């Protein structure tokens, strides 16, 4: 597992799709299939590009558009019952089936993921996702701008929520699994990266 800080040129950073496709070229294997990586956008505006915190299973190699600043080999050593700081940009949703009777490819009724617009439901979603791995001691749900994107031929939305707070570890391997694999949908759109720190 490798943790890095990467910057992407503005000309290759208009949509989250462009961020994904641009970050992709740091690991040349086809088809891996991958992503074996997660990332979190901290600064969105140029120059030089957009700053990103990239967790991966390989060592990134800088390209023309994607520039690595620092790289780290890291082993998460988590102890039980220890208070920690956490940050997680996530996509809290509810899969429901459409009030409009739109049709998918199979001729059945289409489903839609909808944002949870109430704090209680978001926090409930969070502690639910964590489960027996950890218990949320304190949480700040930061409301973000709705993100839009393009490609391949579809224009869609990703409403994100940025959780920042304190938690306590109950089970370490489960939490390591949560960090490594990611939490929630839109993992390719810069969600699911759980960042931890000591207080």
């Amino acid at each position: 597992m490798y943790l890095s800080k990467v910057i992407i040129a503005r000309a290759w950073s208009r949509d989250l799709y462009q961020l994904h496709q641009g970050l992709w070229h740091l690991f040349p294997n086809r088809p891996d299939a991958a992503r074996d990586f997660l990332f979190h956008v901290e600064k969105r505006n140029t120059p030089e590009g957009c700053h990103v915190l990239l967790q991966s299973a390989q060592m990134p190699v800088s390209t023309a558009v994607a520039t690595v600043i620092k790289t780290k080999q890291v082993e998460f050593q988590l102890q039980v019952g220890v208070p920690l700081y956490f940050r997680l940009r996530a996509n809290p949703i509810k899969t429901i089936l459409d009030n409009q009777k739109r049709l998918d490819s199979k001729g059945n009724i289409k489903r839609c993921r909808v944002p949870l617009i109430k704090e209680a439901e978001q926090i409930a979603w969070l502690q639910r996702k964590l489960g027996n791995a950890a218990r949320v001691e304190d949480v700040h749900p930061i409301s973000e701008r709705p993100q839009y994107f393009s490609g391949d031929g579809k224009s869609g939305k990703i409403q994100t929520v940025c959780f920042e707070g304190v938690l306590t570890i109950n089970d370490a391997p489960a939490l390591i699994d949560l960090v490594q694999q990611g939490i929630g949908p839109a993992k390719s759109m810069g969600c699911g990266l759980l960042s931890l720190a000591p207080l």
């Binding site: 208009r14 949509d15 709705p146 839009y148 994107f149 393009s150 224009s155």
Partner: protein
């Protein structure tokens, strides 16, 4: 091969979300980044590049607000519709030196200034005229804008 007034109408009928996405933009080049723009402007000119710049300008002006630019048809006695210059002059909130600076601006900058004027003016004008001037936006069009403003104030 010409852009219709329908765009304006479309801009009027579009939902608040996309309008919010479009309104908060600094430069016309930054307008390219957002998808709602492509969805709005798709019927009229893409992918024929001849209109693209113009469209970028037009929508940008429209990006001032949903009801900033108030459209008024030309009277049968008027023969020609109220022009952008005449509009900004009639508003009474605009000082001529900023239109001077508008005529002295270059590329993206001018649009930046122009939008800023519209929001402060809440002008009434014939939209096809403004669209026509924005399509080319040559030196003569700028100078004509200034003509209309200064002449309108001096004559009335």
């Amino acid at each position: 091969e010409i852009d219709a007034m329908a765009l304006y109408r479309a801009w009027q009928q579009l939902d608040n979300g996309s309008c919010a996405q479009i309104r908060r933009v600094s430069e016309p080049d930054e307008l390219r980044d957002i998808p709602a723009f492509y969805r709005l402007v798709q019927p009229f000119g893409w992918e024929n590049p001849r209109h693209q710049q113009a469209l970028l300008r037009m929508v940008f002006c429209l990006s001032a607000g949903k009801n900033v630019i108030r459209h008024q048809d030309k009277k049968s006695e008027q023969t020609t519709g109220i022009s952008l210059g005449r509009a900004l002059a009639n508003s009474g909130r605009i000082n001529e030196r900023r239109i001077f600076q508008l005529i002295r601006a270059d590329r993206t900058a001018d649009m930046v200034q122009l939008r800023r004027l519209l929001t402060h003016a809440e002008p009434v004008l014939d939209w096809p005229l403004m669209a026509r001037m924005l399509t080319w936006w040559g030196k003569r069009e700028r100078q004509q804008l200034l003509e209309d403003f200064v002449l309108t104030t001096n004559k009335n």
